[PDB]
């Protein structure tokens, strides 16, 4: 009973939480990349238009 419970309820649940956390972290990474691209664009615009 304990083996079945661990193999069916516990481990898949922990795996699902791991997947969810990974997805959230990857989302935050993508947003940070977007922000960095915008910052670089602004820097280039200022430098190339009015120094």
Partner 1 sequence: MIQGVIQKIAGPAVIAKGMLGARMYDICKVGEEGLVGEIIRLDGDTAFVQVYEDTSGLKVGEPVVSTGLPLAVELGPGMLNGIYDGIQRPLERIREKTGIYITRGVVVHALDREKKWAWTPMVKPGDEVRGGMVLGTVPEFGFTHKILVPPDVRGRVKEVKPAGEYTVEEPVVVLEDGTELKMYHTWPVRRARPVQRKLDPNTPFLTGMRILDVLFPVAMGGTAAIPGPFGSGKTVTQQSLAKWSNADVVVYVGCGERGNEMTDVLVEFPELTDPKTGGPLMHRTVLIANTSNMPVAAREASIYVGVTIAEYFRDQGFSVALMADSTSRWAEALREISSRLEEMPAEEGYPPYLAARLAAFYERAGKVITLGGEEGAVTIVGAVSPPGGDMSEPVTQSTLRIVGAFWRLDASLAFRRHFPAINWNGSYSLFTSALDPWYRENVAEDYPELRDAISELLQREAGLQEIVQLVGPDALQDAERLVIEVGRIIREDFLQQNAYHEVDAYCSMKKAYGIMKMILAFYKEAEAAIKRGVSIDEILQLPVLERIGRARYVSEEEFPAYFEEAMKEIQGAFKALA
Partner 2 sequence: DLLKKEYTGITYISGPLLFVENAKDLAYGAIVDIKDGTGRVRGGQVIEVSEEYAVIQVFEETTGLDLATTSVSLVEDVARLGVSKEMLGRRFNGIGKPIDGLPPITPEKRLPITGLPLNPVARRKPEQFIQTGISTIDVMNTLVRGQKLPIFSGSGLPANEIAAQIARQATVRPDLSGEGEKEEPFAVVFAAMGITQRELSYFIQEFERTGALSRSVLFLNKADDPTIERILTPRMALTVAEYLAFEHDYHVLVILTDMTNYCEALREIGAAREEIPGRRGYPGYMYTDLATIYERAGVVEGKKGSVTQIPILSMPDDDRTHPIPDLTGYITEGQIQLSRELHRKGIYPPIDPLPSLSRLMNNGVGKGKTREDHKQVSDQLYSAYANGVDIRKLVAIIGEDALTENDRRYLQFADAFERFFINQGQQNRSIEESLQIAWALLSMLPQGELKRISKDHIGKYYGQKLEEIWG
Q: Return residues touching partner 1 (CB under 8 A).
A: 26-27, 30-31, 33-40, 42-43, 46, 51
Binding residue (CB under 8 A) for partner 2 from 8, 17, 23, 33: 33
Residue 7 interacts with which of partner 2, partner 1, none, CB < 5 to 8 Å by class: none
The answer to whether residue 37 forms part of the interface with partner 2 (CB under 8 A) is yes
Using CB under 8 A as the binding rule, whether residue 19 contacts partner 2 is answered as no
Q: Give CA separation, 39 vs 8, 14, 28, 30, 36, in Å.
A: 47, 38, 17, 14, 5
């Amino acid at each position: 009973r304990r083996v079945n419970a661990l193999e069916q309820v516990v481990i898949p649940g922990i795996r699902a939480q791991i997947r969810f956390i990974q997805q959230v972290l990857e989302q935050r990474e993508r947003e940070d990349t977007f922000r960095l691209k915008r910052i670089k664009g602004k820097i280039e615009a200022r430098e190339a238009e009015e120094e």
